[PDB]
């Protein structure tokens, strides 16, 4: 039956600061996986070259472009953050591949999401390893007649999907191997910067169900147990 | 620094092989991304039996992402097999496997029973005029420009698991003639009560339309085994 090949395959991409899974239908990442360590955050502002590039290893039919974003009113929000990888120039520049980028409401990118990223980095002082998994969500809302719909904008000629929400899963690895799970969801909206990050914790099961992804079985295969944080 | 993928890679491609088809599955929509069949003429059994299994949830999909009959029940949508049951009358198992809900998408009943069924019949009918008829079928989620000027993707989700309701469906027939040359017909119908009397040809679309919108690639793989396809 596969005489003429399979119409689509798993699109994994390994970069020097992350690995990701790419969804060609959304023209966006499904999840991005980083590993934070305290020494990987130390660095200077030496070269400061920061231009988002389009991912040439994604077919043109399904590759977001800078044009898709300009004039959209949406910031180019890097899922794997540049500041996570100061120690290496290449690790920083790879976060500027648009394959690592999703349309974010500017206020969110600059304030509440950015504060979530700095919290994640701040945890690198108290844990020997901070694994970070970031990605989009397209959450349905129930109308008053009982019917539910997924609705999200697409921007640019390439119809790049604007997520309704974003998730960030933190696998906090202490020195002794104990592991702490913190799962955050924020709407793709102007989130009040003064609400504490604790309020955005959600059970990891709700992210797994809504994302089509699975975390807890792969964690708790090598963790044995895990402390599920729900502030 | 240890290694990046120490915990799991959260997403894995999900290919399923059945005796009647190959499919790849998308857990977010709780539906298939595409289904690939090969219709061959004696693979339609003119003299045979009629054993229709029940629709069954695919237990090889994690329950977080598995469509159930409860999800369709009361939705008002038919359980539309992407790989049609009538395509595999040769074997009882090859047809039983089309009733795995991983092969199923919510279809407007009128579409599934009248216009999309006729398209399935028409594709079976070209098994008489071609060596092999390869059929790839899948959902589409097409955006619309609204009154504010911005384009939006909007679709219903049904049942407790929020199974995605495609806005459109596509079907791509790879027609392999005797001279081994391949003609390509690709159709698109809206998930809607399509007028039965409209000629199927009017639903033909350029394959690039499908590839662009579905996120899939067909032409490069055809030229990878053939050398040249013909018109749209």
UniProtKB/Swiss-Prot annotation, chain A:
Annotated Mg(2+) binding sites: 109
Annotated segments matching region Essential for deoxyribonuclease activity: 223-231
Active site: residue positions: 78 (proton acceptor)
List the GO terms this entry assigns under cellular component, sorted alphabetically. mitochondrion; perikaryon; perinuclear region of cytoplasm
User: Phosphothreonine-modified residues are where?
Assistant: 65
User: What cofactor is this protein dependent on?
Assistant: Mg(2+)
Q: Where is this site: Essential for catalytic activity?
A: 47
Post-translational modification as stated in the protein's UniProt record:
GSK3-beta-mediated phosphorylation at Thr-65 is necessary for its interaction with YWHAG and the induction of autophagy.
Note the effect listed for residue 47 to Q.
Loss of deoxyribonuclease activity
Top-rank taxon: Eukaryota
EC assignment? 3.1.30.-
Which GO terms fall under biological process for this protein? apoptotic DNA fragmentation; cellular response to calcium ion; cellular response to glucose stimulus; cellular response to hypoxia; cellular response to oxidative stress; DNA catabolic process; DNA damage response; in utero embryonic development
Its localization reads:
Mitochondrion
Q: Which UniProt keywords apply?
A: Disulfide bond, Endonuclease, Hydrolase, Magnesium, Metal-binding, Mitochondrion, Nuclease, Phosphoprotein, Transit peptide
- The main enzyme category here is hydrolase
**Physiological role:** Endonuclease that preferentially catalyzes the cleavage of double-stranded 5-hydroxymethylcytosine (5hmC)-modified DNA. The 5hmC-modified nucleotide does not increase the binding affinity, but instead increases the efficiency of cutting and specifies the site of cleavage for the modified DNAs. Shows significantly higher affinity for four-stranded Holliday junction over duplex and single-stranded DNAs. Promotes conservative recombination when the DNA is 5hmC-modified.
Subunit record text: Homodimer; disulfide-linked. Homodimerization is essential for its activity. Interacts with YWHAG.
Entry protein name = Endonuclease G, mitochondrial
Native source species? Mus musculus (Mouse)
